[PDB]
Amino acid sequence: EFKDVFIEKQKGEILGVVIVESGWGSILPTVIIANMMHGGPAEKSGKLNIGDQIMSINGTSLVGLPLSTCQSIIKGLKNQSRVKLNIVR
Known part of the structure; x- marks a missing residue:
């Protein structure tokens, strides 16, 4: 479920x-929203819920890149x- x-927020604010x-043993390994601000931008959209296997951000594929890249x-x-x-999903 793509x-x-x-996630809309104010300039100077991180997604959260x-x-x-x-x-894990499912989908293509890349990233897992292990955590998420309870109410922040991520929770604001009402889509991302801790445990979501994100694929890319603003056109940035998270597949193949380590956590250091995703975090950045x-x-x-x-x-x-x-x-x-x-x-x-």
Whole structure:
């Protein structure tokens, strides 16, 4: 279940999602929203719910890249105003 997650926030604010190197036995390993601000941008959209296997952010495929890359993407999503990240359900 692909999901065009759109996380809108104020410039200078991070999405609020914490994904980890998904290594379970399902889908293509990439990332796992292990955590997510209870009410933050991620929860605001009402789409991403801790445990979502994100696939890409604003056109940035998280597949094949380690956690360091993904984290940097989330951290760099502070002053975007919105996040077009397609996750996997």
